[PDB]
């Protein structure tokens, strides 16, 4: 059930490169748009991923990027997914021509929060939630991408907490200090993602290094209010950054808060 025949794929366009190498746009059976991860040799724990892919095929939500299947008979292996025409959310936010209204920004947060609440309901962590790992479709709907795949990355610079590619600026103190990953580390990251959205893709803690960020957030320093965020919106993102993990909200609570602010500020 999980296995796509790669001969059914027509490759049409380069979409760029990620942690596992090249990603392409194409058609499945000459008709249906797909994206194809071509998994670079040595980049992935492949056997483990493949066993997990069986489970990930059951995860389905309108705001999650849909896994269609995998090609695992030949190397490089392929991950086939839903295609998102407007690319990654970070680059989308950075294009100032969009001149987003604040209601549109809050809708982007809601899109992500819905996906994350779904994943929360299935006891499934993202582990690398950030604007760079969200995608945007042709209707401007934001969807969460590459949830769970951090587990199969073989690159020590990505995996190590002091590595060059580790998401230090999206991580809570307990992740950076003790590697305590939980629903609440995703909550922290989501707060940072809200900040990214309202900051139109600025780097979190843009004047600090990763090392300086780690020490500052351990001392209780936080990100502060983006110009485009109302006090009510800022309260929601800030609530994700409680020092004590158990005092952070759930995604269900965040979703209710976002919906309330939509009713109050629209």
Ligand X SMILES: Cc1c(NC(=O)c2cc3c(s2)CCCC3)cccc1-c1cn(C)c(=O)c(Nc2ccc([C@@H]3C(=O)N(C)CCN3C)cc2)n1
Tokens representing residue 234 in the block: 């800022």
Are the C-beta atoms of 86 and 138 separated by less than 8 Å? yes
Smallest separation, CB 103 to ligand X (Å): 23
Closer to ligand X by Cβ: residue 35 or 255: 35
Task: Give the H/E segment covering residue 143.
Answer: strand 142-144
Q: Tell me whether residue 42 is annotated as binding.
A: no
Smallest separation, CB 211 to ligand X (Å): 22
Closer to ligand X by Cβ: residue 23 or 253: 23
Angle 94-98-100 from CA coordinates, rounded to 5°: 95
Residues that bind ligand X in the complex, under the rule CB under 6 A? 14-20, 23, 35, 37, 65, 81, 83-85, 87, 91, 128, 133, 135, 145-146, 149-150, 153
Smallest separation, CB 235 to ligand X (Å): 29
Please tell me the distance from the alpha carbon of residue 144 to that of residue 213, in angstroms, as a whole number.
25
Q: Tell me whether residue 129 is annotated as binding.
A: no
Active site residues: 128
Helix (H, G, I), strand (E, B) or coil at 220: coil
Backbone torsion region of residue 106, taken as left when φ is above 0, otherwise alpha when ψ lies between -120 and 50, otherwise beta: alpha
Please tell me the distance from the alpha carbon of residue 114 to that of residue 101, in angstroms, as a whole number.
20
- Residue partners of 258: CB distance under 8 A and separation at least 6: 106, 109, 110, 113, 236
Q: Tell me whether residue 83 is annotated as binding.
A: yes
Closer to ligand X by Cβ: residue 210 or 255: 210
Closer to ligand X by Cβ: residue 166 or 198: 166
Q: Tell me whether residue 20 is annotated as binding.
A: yes
Smallest separation, CB 88 to ligand X (Å): 6
Q: Tell me whether residue 37 is annotated as binding.
A: yes
Are the C-beta atoms of 116 and 145 separated by less than 8 Å? no
Residues at the annotated binding site for dasatinib? 81-84
Task: State the binding site.
Answer: 15-23, 37, 81-84, 149
Q: Which residues are annotated as a binding site for ATP?
A: 15-23, 37
């Amino acid at each position: 059930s999980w296995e796509i025949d790669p001969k059914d794929l027509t490759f049409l366009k380069e979409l760029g490169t990620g942690q596992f190498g090249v990603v392409k746009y194409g058609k499945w059976r000459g008709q249906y748009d797909v994206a194809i991860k071509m998994i670079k040799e040595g980049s992935m724990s492949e056997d483990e991923f493949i066993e997990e892919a069986k489970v990930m095929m059951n995860l389905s939500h309108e705001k999650l990027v849909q896994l269609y299947g995998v090609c695992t008979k030949q190397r490089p292996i392929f991950i086939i997914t839903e295609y998102m025409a407007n690319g990654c959310l970070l680059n989308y936010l950075r294009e100032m021509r969009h001149r987003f209204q604040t209601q549109q920004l809050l809708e982007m947060c809601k899109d992500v929060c819905e996906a994350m609440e779904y994943l929360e309901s299935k006891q499934f962590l993202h582990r690398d939630l950030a604007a760079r790992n969200c995608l945007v479709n042709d209707q401007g709907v934001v969807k969460v991408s590459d949830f769970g795949l951090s587990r199969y990355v073989l690159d020590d610079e990505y995996t190590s907490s002091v590595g060059s590619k580790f998401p230090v600026r999206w991580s809570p103190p307990e992740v950076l200090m003790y590697s305590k990953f939980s629903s609440k580390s995703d909550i922290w990251a989501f707060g940072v993602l809200m900040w990214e959205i309202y900051s139109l893709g600025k780097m979190p803690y843009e004047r600090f290094t990763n090392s300086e960020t780690a020490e500052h957030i351990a001392q209780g320093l936080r990100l502060y209010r983006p110009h485009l965020a109302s006090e009510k919106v800022y309260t929601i993102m800030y609530s994700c950054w409680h020092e004590k993990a158990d005092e952070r909200p759930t995604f269900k609570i965040l979703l209710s808060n976002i919906l309330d602010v939509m009713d109050e500020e629209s």
